[PDB]
Design a binder for this molecule. Sequence first.
Ligand SMILES: O=C1C[C@@H]2OCC=C3CN4CC[C@]56c7ccccc7N1[C@H]5[C@H]2[C@H]3C[C@H]46
Ligand SMILES: O=C1C[C@@H]2OCC=C3CN4CC[C@]56c7ccccc7N1[C@H]5[C@H]2[C@H]3C[C@H]46
Ligand SMILES: O=C1C[C@@H]2OCC=C3CN4CC[C@]56c7ccccc7N1[C@H]5[C@H]2[C@H]3C[C@H]46
Ligand SMILES: O=C1C[C@@H]2OCC=C3CN4CC[C@]56c7ccccc7N1[C@H]5[C@H]2[C@H]3C[C@H]46
Ligand SMILES: O=C1C[C@@H]2OCC=C3CN4CC[C@]56c7ccccc7N1[C@H]5[C@H]2[C@H]3C[C@H]46
Ligand SMILES: *[C@@H]1O[C@H](CO)[C@@H](O)[C@H](O)[C@H]1NC(C)=O
Ligand SMILES: *[C@@H]1O[C@H](CO)[C@@H](O)[C@H](O)[C@H]1NC(C)=O
Ligand SMILES: *[C@@H]1O[C@H](CO)[C@@H](O)[C@H](O)[C@H]1NC(C)=O
Ligand SMILES: *[C@@H]1O[C@H](CO)[C@@H](O)[C@H](O)[C@H]1NC(C)=O
Ligand SMILES: *[C@@H]1O[C@H](CO)[C@@H](O)[C@H](O)[C@H]1NC(C)=O
Ligand SMILES: *[C@@H]1O[C@H](CO)[C@@H](O)[C@H](O)[C@H]1NC(C)=O
Ligand SMILES: *[C@@H]1O[C@H](CO)[C@@H](O)[C@H](O)[C@H]1NC(C)=O
Ligand SMILES: *[C@@H]1O[C@H](CO)[C@@H](O)[C@H](O)[C@H]1NC(C)=O
Ligand SMILES: *[C@@H]1O[C@H](CO)[C@@H](O)[C@H](O)[C@H]1NC(C)=O
Lengths: 338, 339, 339, 339, 339
Amino acid sequence: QSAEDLARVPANSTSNILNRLLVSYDPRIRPNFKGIPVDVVVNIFINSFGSIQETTMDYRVNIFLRQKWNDPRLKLPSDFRGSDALTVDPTMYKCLWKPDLFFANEKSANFHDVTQENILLFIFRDGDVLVSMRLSITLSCPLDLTLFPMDTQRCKMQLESFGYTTDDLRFIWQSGDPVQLEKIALPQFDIKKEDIEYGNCTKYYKGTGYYTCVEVIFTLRRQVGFYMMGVYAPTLLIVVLSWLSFWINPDASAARVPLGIFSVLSLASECTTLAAELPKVSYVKALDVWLIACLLFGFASLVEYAVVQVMKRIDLYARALFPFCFLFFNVIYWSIYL
Amino acid sequence: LSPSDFLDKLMGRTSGYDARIRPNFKGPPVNVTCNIFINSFGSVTETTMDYRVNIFLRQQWNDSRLAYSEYPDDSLDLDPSMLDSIWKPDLFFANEKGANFHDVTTDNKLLRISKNGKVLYSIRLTLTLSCPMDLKNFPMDVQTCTMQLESFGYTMNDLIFEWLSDGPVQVAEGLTLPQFILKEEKELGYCTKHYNTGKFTCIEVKFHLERQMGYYLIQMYIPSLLIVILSWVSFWINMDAAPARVALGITTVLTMTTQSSGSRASLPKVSYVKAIDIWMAVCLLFVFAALLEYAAVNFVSRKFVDRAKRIDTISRAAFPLAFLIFNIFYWITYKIIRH
Amino acid sequence: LSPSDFLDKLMGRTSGYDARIRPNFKGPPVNVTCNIFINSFGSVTETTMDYRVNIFLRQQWNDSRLAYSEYPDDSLDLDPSMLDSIWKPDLFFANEKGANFHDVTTDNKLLRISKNGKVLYSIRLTLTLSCPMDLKNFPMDVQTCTMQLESFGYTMNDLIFEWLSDGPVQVAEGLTLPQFILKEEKELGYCTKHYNTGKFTCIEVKFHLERQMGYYLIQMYIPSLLIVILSWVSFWINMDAAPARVALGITTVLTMTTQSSGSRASLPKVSYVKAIDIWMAVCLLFVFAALLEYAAVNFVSRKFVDRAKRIDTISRAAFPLAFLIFNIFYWITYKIIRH
Amino acid sequence: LSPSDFLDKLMGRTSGYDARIRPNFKGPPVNVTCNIFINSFGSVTETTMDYRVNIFLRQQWNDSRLAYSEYPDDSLDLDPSMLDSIWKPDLFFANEKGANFHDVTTDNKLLRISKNGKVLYSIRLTLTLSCPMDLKNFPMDVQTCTMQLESFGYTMNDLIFEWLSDGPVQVAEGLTLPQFILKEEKELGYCTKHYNTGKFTCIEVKFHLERQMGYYLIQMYIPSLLIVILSWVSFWINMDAAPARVALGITTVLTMTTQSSGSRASLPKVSYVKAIDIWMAVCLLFVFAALLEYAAVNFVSRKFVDRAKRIDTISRAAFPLAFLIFNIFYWITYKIIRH
Amino acid sequence: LSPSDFLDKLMGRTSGYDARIRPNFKGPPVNVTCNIFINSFGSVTETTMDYRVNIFLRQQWNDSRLAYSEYPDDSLDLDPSMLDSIWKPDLFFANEKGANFHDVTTDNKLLRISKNGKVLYSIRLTLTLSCPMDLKNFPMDVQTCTMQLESFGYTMNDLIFEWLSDGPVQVAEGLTLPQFILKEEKELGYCTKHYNTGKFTCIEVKFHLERQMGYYLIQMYIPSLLIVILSWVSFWINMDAAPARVALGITTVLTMTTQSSGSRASLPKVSYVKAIDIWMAVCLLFVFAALLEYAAVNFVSRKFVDRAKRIDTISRAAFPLAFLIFNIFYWITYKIIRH
Ligand SMILES: O=C1C[C@@H]2OCC=C3CN4CC[C@]56c7ccccc7N1[C@H]5[C@H]2[C@H]3C[C@H]46
Ligand SMILES: O=C1C[C@@H]2OCC=C3CN4CC[C@]56c7ccccc7N1[C@H]5[C@H]2[C@H]3C[C@H]46
Ligand SMILES: O=C1C[C@@H]2OCC=C3CN4CC[C@]56c7ccccc7N1[C@H]5[C@H]2[C@H]3C[C@H]46
Ligand SMILES: O=C1C[C@@H]2OCC=C3CN4CC[C@]56c7ccccc7N1[C@H]5[C@H]2[C@H]3C[C@H]46
Ligand SMILES: O=C1C[C@@H]2OCC=C3CN4CC[C@]56c7ccccc7N1[C@H]5[C@H]2[C@H]3C[C@H]46
Ligand SMILES: *[C@@H]1O[C@H](CO)[C@@H](O)[C@H](O)[C@H]1NC(C)=O
Ligand SMILES: *[C@@H]1O[C@H](CO)[C@@H](O)[C@H](O)[C@H]1NC(C)=O
Ligand SMILES: *[C@@H]1O[C@H](CO)[C@@H](O)[C@H](O)[C@H]1NC(C)=O
Ligand SMILES: *[C@@H]1O[C@H](CO)[C@@H](O)[C@H](O)[C@H]1NC(C)=O
Ligand SMILES: *[C@@H]1O[C@H](CO)[C@@H](O)[C@H](O)[C@H]1NC(C)=O
Ligand SMILES: *[C@@H]1O[C@H](CO)[C@@H](O)[C@H](O)[C@H]1NC(C)=O
Ligand SMILES: *[C@@H]1O[C@H](CO)[C@@H](O)[C@H](O)[C@H]1NC(C)=O
Ligand SMILES: *[C@@H]1O[C@H](CO)[C@@H](O)[C@H](O)[C@H]1NC(C)=O
Ligand SMILES: *[C@@H]1O[C@H](CO)[C@@H](O)[C@H](O)[C@H]1NC(C)=O
């Protein structure tokens, strides 16, 4: 603070005569104090996007949160030409004002400190201050998996101000390619740059001001192939098996016994075995509707066996009605829940 | 002039101010008007008995040692780093399991001093609060997962917390939980600790949770009830045609045992009897009863055939009455009364 | 004249005081009196042999150096930031696996000096202690899980711990564990470790955790018991029948195997045979024996009926009595003689 | 004099060493020869798409202002405490998720300044590196997990990374991954991130993680083959045995579908079709095709009686040809056509 | 005078003692004699190849600079705060993944300066070491869990570690593990690394974890063996009762497939073949052979019924001998040959 000098030429002497020793650049008060609102220009750059836990409703994402604004109190003097970007080290990162943004739906955010600190700050000639920082956030998006094996989840990330209203701080995107991302592979979902829809949405918190905010809305379409080749076509095959079991002879035979007692057992031991693999969420999902319909059809097959052996005239109607009755449900279900 | 030295002229070293003496020392206690604003909610985990909530917390209190009328700027802001200079009331969540602040891109605290000395202190915490749950009646229950704010070191003769009037606890809209549905009726209340040292203020809030049984109906009630009806239909046949009746009995008992296995495979890990395990043991018992009815009919049948048809008709009239009586008792005692 | 600056002359620079020299140095030891207040309890895991407990730990000791006489206030306390200016006894937990203080809205540390000299120190820890669990008789066993306070580099001629006289460890009232139940009788005493470098003071608590057995009784024991009774009912019918007993025998075998193969996801993953594994293997052996000793009858039958009738008449009393002697052995071995 | 005081003389408030500017500033780049030495390689999961590594990272670079010729020591060391008083290249892993240093007894950083200007900086890091792996051909996949180091602040005008000459990346002998096997062929190259401001330097090393298909081939593939063979043997018999054909048909269909749904809960939880799913679906389809062939030859038996026998004898030679054609079109496209 | 002031007279900034230089400089290397005392040994997981310990590390050494013969107290001890004023050997664990000190109620470390210059250092560490286990013969394996202490930047001619004379590694008396048993045959050796720079010193202690398989012998082997016995007694007795034969065949191959593929969630997930997997596959092959030989007798049936029954009796005599041959050649291989 009160140290006289160490050097006069390089890019540290200009910072020493710019703040914390020279004329008061108070890092507590914003630029254009009681004047115009500061305009922060944010543009994240996603490096990783994963672990969408359907039991906690969160997703982890690593960004490069670049934010760039205009501070007229850091106007670099014309003594030099080589310091077009006066690079201040993060030891003095707190000696100059920085906008206090925060993610309004984060859960446990933290910085990165591998081999160095991961914050870079530039100060330009015309006063434009630039702050890049690597960040590892875990935001929360409310997953509504009612249409579970065919659902589309929108998950949004919203940056906000913390203590500065709209007439003091104001966020705007870079207006050219503001949310970039690397080639990233979700385990179950499918992130797509075609829908990266973003926008401003300021909040009107009552009594105290009108705080600024921006947000990105990713859209994830859960791909269906494992479920379709998993718990759809073998289960439909089990039901079709128990349909075609009506073609075995009942007259002087005993071989429809296993084809009943093992059809219903197999469909039940498929249903309640699947009941652990699915996400543990206690409301009606479309897959559960499919499973209960297939179990109802297996039960219907065995009760048709019962009614033809408690009462040629019923089997010929069942074989042509109920495998034809499956088709209406298989049309309306994939028309409604898809 | 500027705020950053006006705070040094108000609370700093030159002026008279102390950072660990409460307002109105040796007088009336300080009334902290505390309210919260939750954002997230979840991880309500019945294996460790604790949920996790991510709240904003606003405490506002007055101290005339910061009353100023020197210049018209009526909203002073302290940075969240020199926050040890002002006096701020201690507050610890008396049932937490581990909890901490947020420090992303800035410090997530705020301290705004007004003109009349009324200061307003807003923090952003995440909390792993403990909640003693009760799964005696699992798929039809209510949890009264609560949350307390208690003073630490200051008795009720020195500091008193009180909720804000106009909706103290709020909820961020569009808040979905994977299991429960948080009610719109949250009961704010006055807890109070009466310990050997003194009496300590303790405000509290009680959320009500309701587990929605829609998945358990479609996956574990309807199939088992269907299997019980199928086990009826098994011995509802008239003659002694063996393989159909034996087939349906073996079918029903195998699928009921497999249902019970999977129900243990997916449900919470709790070692006392739950209202879903009662209803599975009873269905297993009824399929056992139908198989035993068939075995008894075969054991008496080789006069004998007349008594065999008589006990068959009596059981075919009695088992629906028995299951209806059980189902009536079960659903009244679990869905209606303890609700 | 203020409690901020009175301590700076009582224990600060202009005072003879060292925070690394115990009271009564080169004299009698320091009788630190400790007592605990357990807030939470749980996470009792059989995979890592630990259990997590969230305690209010207080400890008091009186030193002659920290006694004042001219001050108006009886008991003054200092901020937890200046807790490096008083000698505090190094009380470490001899079986922990990681502990951490709490710092929500203020650090949860309190130290209050009385007038005569009695220092009080109350902190809030979140430990995860390690109690070795022995699941030899799993669905009916107790767990004596302990907590061992100790000193770290102060022998018993320097530091000595001891509990309070009335109510050392008082667990909170609303506790509910998912598996166990915390028995309300907490044993407490000395351990007093005698290492090869001196006798180090120690105090310890032992909690008893008893299982709740009702869920295992409903979902493990009773269905398999009814299965083996029904398996005896199977071979009690006539022997001149090829598909009339194979059906019920293989039904009992399939239900037993699917029960014992679905129950393996709800037990603690240890690798020594416990009680429930013995009981689930013996009933499976019994229904297998019933099916095999029916198949041998069906073999030997084809005066050749008399030998099979003798075998059936012997086995119909052999199987239930040889089961209800093992049942006696089991329920006096695991429930009675092994406590 | 002492080496610590000589370091204070060489760089400090006496000489003109500025620890914030690169060596030979306003001049050529400064090459940093970097090499790593991995110690652990595990937790390579498919749920969060990342592995975890534990490396010794070493960097050698030339510093002009750190030469000296008036000291007896051939190469000085530097204390890990006073280590932020020197220039160090900002080097971060561009694909990391969580990274931390170690200090188990002391800091695990070591900085050695030679007599001519060479500087060696060796640290021990633990990293969670994010590699995106695909499981399009799951049980014989070969995943390339990359580790890319790159600069943060300086462009390639200032800082140029390059691997060492002989043995840049070495592996601690005796590693064993649970479900993978690491190949000794590590392909290392340049990365040269082309951004808008400048081309930031970037180097990378790719390990070739290969999987071993033992557990999958014995638990799933060989049972699938055996069940297809049993389905063939079902209709390989003559039509005189009406029970046996449909019995073995239902038998093979059930064991195929339950092997599928039992394997389905031990594969990695993804949502696109793996190579094991195509096999466990086509085998089920061929078992179902054999059973539907039985249904057809029972439907046509209402060329007076050989209308079924000719079709059955055609199937008894046409289904093994279909399975063989699928095997040659599978074990070529997954085992040798995706290397 | 006071031990703090006399200590800072001995080792302060004055009196010529630099902490950043080793004792006996330019001479013989120091002999750091260290020993450990482990408390917890838990979570030996197979999915990440690690194990967590919680040890007391005590290391003693010499330095002539910290010698005195003028003070009454013979063994001074400095508080764990000012431990940066004494040279300490910069050890680290050569394979630990994550590791940390303890900080409950104090720092859990101690440093005593004896009168003869013998310095004694004692830490309490929590470590997560990495041991590369192999589960090739899974329920009968023996693992060697190692722990290596090493120097960080001190050559063999600058510092050497060596174990204590008597009792260098000793466990707590009451510890236990869920799966393994920690034997009392630990081996203590040197594994000195010959790196590029020098021969950095290192010592190693290896524990032998021996797995016990009562749980697997009860719940993984015996059900499948009884299922194989049922598979034999299928065709041992029921000659002409085809509906009482096909049913037992379907049920036995179905319950064996279910037993094989519904009990893999309770086994450690690896990809190479384990012993229990070989045994499961051979039992599946045997029940498949039973069903296939039934189908073969049915095929050769439809003048030759004597040959059919002869093939049946030859198979009923050959299957027990073949299974005993496999069982012996498996058990003497895995239990006695590879142990
Ligand atoms: O005084 C408050 C309490 C209230 O808490 C609910 C959460 C809100 C989120 N933003 C961020 C902090 C807050 C705010 C900003 C500046 C001064 C006071 C203040 N707050 C919270 C407030 C709302 C609005 C605003
Ligand atoms: O002496 C004590 C111990 C006792 O511990 C149980 C927990 C309590 C919580 N609050 C926080 C600290 C405490 C307290 C305040 C002032 C003097 C002594 C004191 N305590 C704890 C006490 C109760 C009450 C109070
Ligand atoms: O030198 C030692 C090693 C020994 O380690 C086993 C555990 C012990 C419990 N406490 C921890 C610190 C210790 C101790 C005190 C004073 C000098 C040396 C010293 N330690 C450990 C010791 C015992 C006793 C004591
Ligand atoms: O302007 C930017 C934004 C952009 O963010 C994506 C991450 C990148 C990583 N490194 C570190 C900071 C950055 C950079 C260096 C110098 C001036 C501007 C600048 N950045 C980020 C940039 C890329 C490239 C570079
Ligand atoms: O250059 C290196 C890399 C190498 O990393 C593997 C582990 C080692 C452990 N100790 C600690 C640092 C190290 C060392 C000392 C002095 C100069 C270079 C140097 N290292 C690491 C080295 C080995 C040997 C030694
Ligand atoms: C975006 O933010 C709010 C949203 O309504 C709006 O008031 C503002 O004018 C918008 N445009 C900007 C900041 O350029
Ligand atoms: C605080 O609350 C108490 C409650 O008894 C009241 O007497 C007092 O007037 C209130 N206000 C102040 C400033 O103490
Ligand atoms: C604090 O005191 C002032 C006195 O003017 C009063 O207006 C204000 O309402 C008080 N605040 C609270 C929270 O009681
Ligand atoms: C501590 O208790 C012992 C009794 O064992 C007594 O001899 C000693 O004087 C006590 N010390 C103090 C300071 O009270
Ligand atoms: C205070 O010290 C004296 C010992 O002379 C005794 O009255 C008492 O044991 C101490 N009080 C405590 C330990 O609370
Ligand atoms: C560093 O200096 C040495 C001195 O011999 C020289 O050989 C080498 O080329 C220089 N550069 C690098 C990158 O090592
Ligand atoms: C660094 O590498 C460059 C090649 O790009 C070479 O010209 C130069 O001599 C090397 N050494 C230094 C100190 O720049
Ligand atoms: C340490 O070990 C070396 C090994 O040669 C020995 O020469 C020396 O006397 C030992 N003791 C010391 C340095 O105090
Ligand atoms: C330290 O020096 C003494 C001097 O006699 C010697 O006996 C001892 O072996 C040395 N080492 C240790 C570890 O005490």
